[PDB]
Every structure is written in structure tokens, then in C-alpha cells.
Amino acid sequence: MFWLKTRIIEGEGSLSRLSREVKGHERVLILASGSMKRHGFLSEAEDYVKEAGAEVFSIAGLPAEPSVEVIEEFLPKVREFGPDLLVAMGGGSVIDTTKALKVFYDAPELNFGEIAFIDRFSKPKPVPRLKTLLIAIPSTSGAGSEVSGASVLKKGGVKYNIVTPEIAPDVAILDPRLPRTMPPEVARNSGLDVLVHGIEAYTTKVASPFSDAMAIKAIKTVYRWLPLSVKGDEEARARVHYAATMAGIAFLNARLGLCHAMSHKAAWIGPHGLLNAVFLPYVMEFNASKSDYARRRYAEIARELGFQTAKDLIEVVKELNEMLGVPKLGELVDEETFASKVEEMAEKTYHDGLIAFNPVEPKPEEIKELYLKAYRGE
Amino acid sequence: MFWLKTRIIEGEGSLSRLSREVKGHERVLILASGSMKRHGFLSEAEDYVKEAGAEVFSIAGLPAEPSVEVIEEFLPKVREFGPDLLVAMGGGSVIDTTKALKVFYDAPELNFGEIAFIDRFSKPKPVPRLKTLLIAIPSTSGAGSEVSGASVLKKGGVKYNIVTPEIAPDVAILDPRLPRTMPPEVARNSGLDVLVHGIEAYTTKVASPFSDAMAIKAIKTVYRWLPLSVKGDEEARARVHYAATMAGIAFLNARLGLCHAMSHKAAWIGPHGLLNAVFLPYVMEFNASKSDYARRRYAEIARELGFQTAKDLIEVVKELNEMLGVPKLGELVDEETFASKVEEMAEKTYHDGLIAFNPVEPKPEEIKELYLKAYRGE
Numbered sequence A, B: 001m002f003w004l005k006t007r008i009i010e011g012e013g014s015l016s017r018l019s020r021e022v023k024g025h026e027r028v029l030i031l032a033s034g035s036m037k038r039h040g041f042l043s044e045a046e047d048y049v050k051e052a053g054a055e056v057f058s059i060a061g062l063p064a065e066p067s068v069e070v071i072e073e074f075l076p077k078v079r080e081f082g083p084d085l086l087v088a089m090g091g092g093s094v095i096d097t098t099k100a101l102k103v104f105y106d107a108p109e110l111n112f113g114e115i116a117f118i119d120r121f122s123k124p125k126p127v128p129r130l131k132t133l134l135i136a137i138p139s140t141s142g143a144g145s146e147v148s149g150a151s152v153l154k155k156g157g158v159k160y161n162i163v164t165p166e167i168a169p170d171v172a173i174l175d176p177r178l179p180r181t182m183p184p185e186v187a188r189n190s191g192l193d194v195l196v197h198g199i200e201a202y203t204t205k206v207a208s209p210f211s212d213a214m215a216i217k218a219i220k221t222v223y224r225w226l227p228l229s230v231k232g233d234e235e236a237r238a239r240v241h242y243a244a245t246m247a248g249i250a251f252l253n254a255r256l257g258l259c260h261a262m263s264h265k266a267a268w269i270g271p272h273g274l275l276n277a278v279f280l281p282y283v284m285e286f287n288a289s290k291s292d293y294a295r296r297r298y299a300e301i302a303r304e305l306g307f308q309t310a311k312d313l314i315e316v317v318k319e320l321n322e323m324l325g326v327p328k329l330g331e332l333v334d335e336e337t338f339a340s341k342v343e344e345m346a347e348k349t350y351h352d353g354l355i356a357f358n359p360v361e362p363k364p365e366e367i368k369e370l371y372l373k374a375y376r377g378e
């Protein structure tokens, strides 16, 4: 099974094509991150929507970590303005917020509780056909969220998933100018997100040749270019920006695995892509020892980078962490804070629906010793 | 830009899926190649359709390399029956005929010459929104028509296109069981079409990273696996089947170039896949000699296969043609018939829309020269 609902416009200055894509439309709403205001990209985009003869209304400065509580502040304003096209311009959380917004805006009657996964034993009601077009313009590189029909919200501090094709964007615009404004830390952290997505997508149970083609290329590109991107090279920024969407196309179809689940639960420690990379080598080790499939697949990636064995890949990834100056896990959290929460973290990683796609099904106890190997810096 | 309308369903016995996809509809028309009847797959298809509770009607023995007059006789039939779902089961010829039929079924006020790409320069009448669902099921590996928006009909021993996303199939089902009954020359010819698609789609002016990913995976897979497939290795057949569609996705988006334009105008000579294989090494040499871009992109492909230079790849291709018994051009057509037509072929190739996407635009004189190079078996 391989599909892609989203239509992808890439290119230097491709933001200008927002002119073509809004034709026909009356009242366009842009949700935007702070930085997209500051660096003037929000202005540019506002021009294009006027250019095309439509009303535009902007909310900038949306906070990280999407939540219902946050969305509920705007929602009244959004209803007042009544847009017939949504545009998200920002990172993952701007785009994911905008997806959740479409649901509430197009289907006001729906109950949030009816229609959100929390764990693997959650069945929700499916989401009915929605109507309002969604254009996604990512400014990091990147979350993949601009091609995916998934969105992750908090209500009352609890993490929820919403999963439907209806909220996968109709168009994504990939303009390398935008992520050239990333500071090096955010370049690094989101860039490792891509690599980790790539590798998990390649080693789930539902991988296809088609999703494999996008994963492999994304991996090859991030390995080659990310160190240069982090240091600010213009070309490199553009190459990793496209690789981020490639990996998005891949895990849209193939889903993800144990590293992601573990990094979801460890999210209070620090940033999502940072922890992902920190756990990756340990998760790879676990998967390869227990699974003849994982070992084969890691080995295939290794060869695509001009090495040989699954051991080579794990070492390649440890080395790339060291190169880019990724912290040890115990430079972020003290040992008692950690060992307290570590019982409850391995519990709820077990109840995550993503481990159905992992090439091994771990028990809660094995998961715990993984969190602890990684703290050991083994 | 990158997009994919077609939902792809792949895997062993995935033909059994027809039944879920037709759920909802009442009158199914299957158009099939003769071989699909002979090998029992047509009966299998009909059962699945009946099982979903719809009336089925089959027409089998659609001709290879269809002409425009194929429409005129079959179209009466469709109207007679009046389907709300079309299924094409066969090679590219059959899928293209089904495609063409949808146009004249759903939009009865059109005619081939209005809407068909004849001249580069005289643009044609656009095709309006059509309505009838179309499911493609390729049995060769392959023309890639199961994901493309094109249909190729002969008028007067020359190939022209209809192009619109309205005739890109809604679903493609990829069951390796079907292509496993290809006789080895069909498997050779359609298999080398994949290789040529990949290389051309990698080298157009409009190649994106996204199409490249599909194109490169396609090229690698075919190079490794096609020799085994031609002998009849069951696994190899599966692998080249999925690759055929990868190449399709690539050239849906990146288009094709001079080799295909040349093949289309020389269609009166032989099978599409064969002619392409014959011209390709000459098209590559020509492009390398005129274009730094072509030279560098060929080297990239070369290195993915474990060689160095554009010249390595040209020789790889020559040596695979020989390994697979691909005949010389001088064996397929006599000298004086060729010499009497090569001016006309070159001129019509030059007015073909595809040569705008070629890295270099060649003169009518240069196209003629390339045809002759090919003939001399240089």
C-alpha cells in the first residue's frame, strides 16, 4: 500500500506559487510561527494572497507543543473570520496545530474524545469528510508533518493522536529560504529527526519497495549533507529540506517503531529529535540482536552508505552524534530524577500503538533496561 | 513539483483486492489481454467482482501496440454495457486503450486530433473533468502506464500522446503472479523499457529529488534482477514488477526525453521496449557530448551501480543489451525502407513534445544522424 494525497511544490522561491494556489478563494487564514514574522516571510506570503485577490488574516507566534487549550483561544476568532483555505507556515507544531484546527473548524459537532487514539487498545470513531483546503509550508527540516495525515495534541497534559487522510495537507510548499533561517541547534535536532524517521521507516513490518525508495534517499542525503547544513551551507540546507519530506512520505506509509515511542515518553527531558538520536543506537542494538529481519535491513542501509554490516551502521550513527556534539543522556537529567520516572516510562511505551510496527515486540522490562543502558552511556 | 494520484496496492495475490475496491459499484467492465484469459487470471478477476455483488462483463484479446481505430470498434461496446467502473488487465497497450476509452465514454464531444499532442507548437484542446473510476492491473513489467496520465495511440504507424491527470488510474494493483507468465522476450522488452524510463527520467530538465528516488531504485533493481527474470526466476519477476511502477512514478513527474520521442516515431519497426533499448546507448553518447549536466547525472547513476563515469554506464548498457540478445537495428528493417523514411522520422521526432525535456535540444539533422548511427550498429 502506497499513496500520497499531498501535492509537493519544491524549489528556490517556491513560496511565490502561493499566488496560483489561492486563486478561486475568498478568505485565507495563515497560522505562522514567530520566526516567520520576524524574518519577513509572513509579509511576503500575505502579499501573494492579496496578489490573488483574496482576504488574508494572520495569527503569528503560536507556541510549541500543540494543545487543545491553546487551540481553544483562537478557535472563536477563526470562526468569526470564516476562512475557506488554511495555510500553515512554520515547524511541525504549527502544521500539526493547523491540522487539528481544520477538524474542529470543519466538524464542530465532533467530540475530541471520540476521535483520538491514546493507546493501542483505543478504537476511535473515524473522521467524516472535511472540506477546507490545507496548504503546508515547513520552515524546519524537519518533522515530515507536511505530508502526513497524523497530528499530535495535548489535552490536560495527556498526549493524543489524531489520524485521518482528511487532515493530510492538500499542498506542501518546500522553499529552502525558510529553513536557512534555522539556528544551528534547530538545524541539527530536526536533521537527526529525519535520519531516525528514515531508519525506522525502513525497518518496520509494513515497509514497501515504494516507501523504501524514499527512506534510503533521505538517509543518504542527511548523512552526506547535515554536518555542512548545521554549519550554514546554503546548498546543504536545501538538500536536507527535501530529504525531510522524503522521509515524511516514507513513514506516512511504513509508520515508525520503538525509538519514536520511547522518545515520545521521554519528551519532558528535552527535544524530540535530540532524544531520538540519543536512543537510536541502543534501539538498533536491541533490534539487531533479537531480529534477523532488522539485522538484514540495517545491513542494507550500511551498504548504501558504503559500509558493510549492521554493526557498521550503529557505529556510523554513534560517530555522527559525536561529530554534531549530541549530548550524553546524563548531561540533560540527573540520575534520581531519571530513575524515578523510568519505571513509568517503560510502562506506557508498552501501551504505544507504534510497537506493533517495530520488528520486535518488547516486553515492559526490556524497554526499561534500554532507557537505562542509554543513561549509562553504554 | 511531485504528485501521485494513483493509490498503489502491491503484493502476492493482491488481485484478491479487486473485491474491496469495487464494493459500491454496480456494472464493472473488464478489458483484458488474451493471455490473461488463457492463464485463468481473468476468471479469477470476475469471481472477485461478482463476490462484491456487481455485474461484470469482460472483453478480452485487446491488441498490442493499439492504433486509434482500436477506439472506434470497442467504444460502441462500452456504451452498450454502461459501466461505472473500468478495469484494465493486461500490459501497457491494454491499459492505454482503457484510458482512451474513458475519455470518449465520459466526454463524448471530443476527438483524438483535438486533444492529442501532435505538434509541440500547436497546443491542443484541454480535457474536462471525467467521472468514471479506473483500476489498472499491469501484467507486464512494464510500461508504467498504471500510474501515468498518458495514453499512446498509433495514427499511421506513429505514436502520439493524450495527456491529462483525469486518465491517471485511481488504483494500481501489482500482483507478481501475473507477470510470471510473460514469455522471456516480453519480459526482456518490457524490462528494458523500465531501465530506459529510469535513465531518461533521471536526466530530464525537470528531474526533482523526489522522482530521482524512484528512478534510481528502479534502475538498480532492474540491472541486478532482469537477467534472472528473463530466465524465469520467480523472485526476480516480483522485484522487477514493483520497479516498473517506480519508474512510472518517476516519469509521471520528471517526464521522458529523446530516446522515447525517437522510439515513438519509429514505432512501425518493432516493439516499443526493444527500440528504446536499441537507441538508448546512442542517445546517451549524444547527450554526454553536448551536456555537462547529462555527463554528471550519468556518472551519478554509474556510481550507484558501482562504476565511475558516464562512459562506464554507456558500456554497461551496451553489454546488457548483448547479454539479453537484443538484436541490432539492421536486423529489423531493410536499408532502403529505412533510408527512405529517416528524414520524415527525424522531422516528426523534432516536433514531439518530449524533446523539450531532453537535456539538449537536437536539430532535425542531428536526429537523422542518430537514427543512422543506430542503423550502422556502431
Ligand SMILES: NC(=O)c1ccc[n+]([C@@H]2O[C@H](COP(=O)([O-])OP(=O)(O)OC[C@H]3O[C@@H](n4cnc5c(N)ncnc54)[C@H](OP(=O)(O)O)[C@@H]3O)[C@@H](O)[C@H]2O)c1
Residues within 6 Å of the ligand: B033, B034, B035, B036, B061, B062, B063, B064, B065, B066, B090, B091, B092, B093, B094, B096, B139, B140, B141, B142, B143, B144, B145, B148, B149, B150, B151, B152, B159, B178, B179, B180, B181, B182, B183, B186, B189, B190, B193, B272, B273
Ligand atoms: N502511458 C505510458 O506511460 C507508456 C509509457 C511507455 C510505453 N507505453 C505504451 O505501452 C505499450 C507497451 O506495452 P507492454 O510493454 O506493457 O506490453 P504490451 O504491448 O501491453 O503487450 C505485449 C505482449 O505481451 C503479452 N503479454 C502481456 N502480459 C503477459 C503475461 N502475463 N503472460 C504472457 N503474455 C503476456 C501480450 O500477449 P496477448 O496480447 O496475447 O495477451 C502482448 O502481445 C506500448 O504500446 C507503449 O506505447 C505507455
Ligand SMILES: Nc1ncnc2c1ncn2[C@@H]1O[C@H](COP(=O)(O)OP(=O)(O)O)[C@@H](O)[C@H]1OP(=O)(O)O
Residues within 6 Å of the ligand: A033, A034, A035, A036, A061, A062, A064, A065, A090, A091, A092, A093, A094, A139, A140, A141, A142, A143, A178, A179, A180, A181, A182, A183, A186, A190, A273
Ligand atoms: N526558520 C526558522 N528560523 C528560526 N527559528 C525557527 C525557524 N523555524 C522554526 N524555528 C524555531 O524552532 C522551534 C522548533 O519548532 P517546532 O517545535 O515546530 O519544530 P519541529 O519542526 O521539529 O516540530 C520553534 O520554537 C521556532 O521558534 P518560533 O516559533 O518562535 O519561530
Ligand SMILES: [Fe+3]
Residues within 6 Å of the ligand: B143, B193, B197, B260, B272, B276
Ligand atoms: Fe517506455
